[PDB]
Amino acid sequence: PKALIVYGSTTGNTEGVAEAIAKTLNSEGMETTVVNVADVTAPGLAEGYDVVLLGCSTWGDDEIELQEDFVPLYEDLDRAGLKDKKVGVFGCGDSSYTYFCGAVDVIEKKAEELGATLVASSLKIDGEPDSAEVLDWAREVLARV
Amino acid sequence: PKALIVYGSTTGNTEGVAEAIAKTLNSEGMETTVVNVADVTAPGLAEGYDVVLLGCSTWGDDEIELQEDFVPLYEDLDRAGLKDKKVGVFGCGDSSYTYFCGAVDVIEKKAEELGATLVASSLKIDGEPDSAEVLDWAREVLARV
Ligand SMILES: Cc1cc2nc3c(=O)[nH]c(=O)nc-3n(C[C@H](O)[C@H](O)[C@H](O)COP(=O)(O)O)c2cc1C
Ligand SMILES: Cc1cc2nc3c(=O)[nH]c(=O)nc-3n(C[C@H](O)[C@H](O)[C@H](O)COP(=O)(O)O)c2cc1C
Numbered sequence: 001p002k003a004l005i006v007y008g009s010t011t012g013n014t015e016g017v018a019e020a021i022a023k024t025l026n027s028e029g030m031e032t033t034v035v036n037v038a039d040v041t042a043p044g045l046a047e048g049y050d051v052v053l054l055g056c057s058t059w060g061d062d063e064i065e066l067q068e069d070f071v072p073l074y075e076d077l078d079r080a081g082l083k084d085k086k087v088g089v090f091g092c093g094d095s096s097y098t099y100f101c102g103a104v105d106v107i108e109k110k111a112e113e114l115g116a117t118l119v120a121s122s123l124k125i126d127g128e129p130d131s132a133e134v135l136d137w138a139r140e141v142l143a144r145v
Numbered sequence: 146p147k148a149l150i151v152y153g154s155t156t157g158n159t160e161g162v163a164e165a166i167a168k169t170l171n172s173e174g175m176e177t178t179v180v181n182v183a184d185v186t187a188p189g190l191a192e193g194y195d196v197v198l199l200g201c202s203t204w205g206d207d208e209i210e211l212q213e214d215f216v217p218l219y220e221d222l223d224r225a226g227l228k229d230k231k232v233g234v235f236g237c238g239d240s241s242y243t244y245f246c247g248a249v250d251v252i253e254k255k256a257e258e259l260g261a262t263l264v265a266s267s268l269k270i271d272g273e274p275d276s277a278e279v280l281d282w283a284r285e286v287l288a289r290v
Contacts, residue, residue: 063208064244064251075243098220099209105254106209106247122254 001145002048003032006040007055008070013092014055017129021053021090024138030145038069042076051086051119051145054111056103058093064102067091074107083115088141090123100124119144146290147193148175152200153182153215153248158237159202162274166198166235169283175290183214187221196231196264196290199256201248203238209247219252228260233286235268245269264289 003025009015018034025032030050037056046052054073059065066074073080089108093101101124108122120140123133148170154160160181167177178194182201191197201215211219218225234253238246246269253267265285270278 060208063205063210064247065208071243098216099251102209102251105251106244109250109254 001030001050003030003051003053003145004046004049005032005034005053005055006037006045006073007034008037008067009055009057010059010067013125014057014067014090017090017092017125017134018053018055020129020131020134021138024135025142028142030142036069037073040073042073042079044079044081045073046081046085051088051141052082053088053090053141054107056091056107058091058097058099058101058103062098064099064106066103066106070103070107074110077110078114082111085116086119086145087111087116088119088122088137090125090137092125092129095126100126146175146195148177148196148198148290149191149194150177150179150198150200151182151185151190151218153212154200154202155204155212158270158274159200159212159235162235162237162270162279163200165274165276165279166283169280170287173287175287181214182218185218187218188224189226190218191226191230194230196233196286197227198233198235198286199252201236201252203236203242203244203246203248209244209251211248211251215248219255222255223259227256230261231264231289232256232261233264233267233282235270235282237270237274240271245271
């Protein structure tokens with residue numbers, strides 16, 4: 001099977017989680033392409049992948065701001081081919097702020113409204129990722145695809 | 146059975162939806178308590194209710210914000226006794242915005258992480274509330290009590 005990981009990341013945190021997910025998936029025979037969301041467009045993006053993992057950090061002062069590179073994909077996510085596609089959502093944040101990983105909830109709800117199959121409960125990284133939590137999430141995705 | 150309807154509303158729209166839902170529930174034999182979230186504190190809020198309906202509009206000048214009175218309830222929602230509780234989420238918004246009722250997305254996701262049972266898909270109200278849409282949702286809730 002093939003996986004796509006698309007991430008929005010300002011300081012590299014969510015990018016590092018994407019890369020760590022991909023290293024496991026690739027090691028377990030699921031060919032995985034990791035791309036900055038800034039470099040993709042929505043139409044047909046999920047077609048041809050058996051699973052798509054969406055990563056996005058949360059920013060904004062006293063608000064949920066999606067990491068800015070992700071917003072155009074969120075706006076047009078209805079064109080990506082997610083109906084009955086396996087999806088998982090992840091992202092970095094920090095529980096000292098108001099809406100801890102709120103972008104992850106916003107993106108996961110839209111995926112669900114668009115008919116995606118959510119492979120696992122979302123991965124919400126508080127601060128610096130722990131390799132155990134990232135690895136177990138990658139194993140859920142593998143088990144479900 | 147007893148229903149709690151807790152709402153955050155700045156211009157009265159989600160308040161008016163709360164009242165319309167309550168009319169339905171009360172006409173179908175529930176004892177409904179309606180409260181503005183500005184007047185409550187989180188600890189133990191849900192205790193003794195058969196179903197809890199959480200209503201909140203979407204604000205924020207630039208991005209997603211919960212209606213301001215709801216924010217402290219959301220932040221301390223873990224104290225509200227939602228584990229194994231039947232919950233429904235509703236809210237007003239405007240689909241001209243990027244994040245249409247994004248406060249509903251965020252509250253719904255948190256309620257499920259806290260172990261609540263969602264009794265119905267969440268109700269997202271676009272602009273002026275439609276009485277048929279509200280009534281259909283209230284009847285979905287009543288059938289799960
Ligand atoms: C001004 C500002 C606002 C933030 N707001 C949030 C927030 O609302 N929720 C959250 O969980 N984390 C919040 N964060 C934490 C960032 O998501 C966190 O630093 C994350 O590691 C960034 O990931 P990235 O490098 O992939 O962009 C905020 C950080 C800053 C500096
Ligand atoms: C400044 C401002 C920001 C808003 N932002 C959003 C938004 O991000 N998403 C949305 O769906 N609706 C948004 N709305 C629409 C309000 O949610 C809508 O007017 C609603 O009826 C208010 O309900 P309330 O009277 O219960 O507070 C915004 C409205 C205003 C005035």
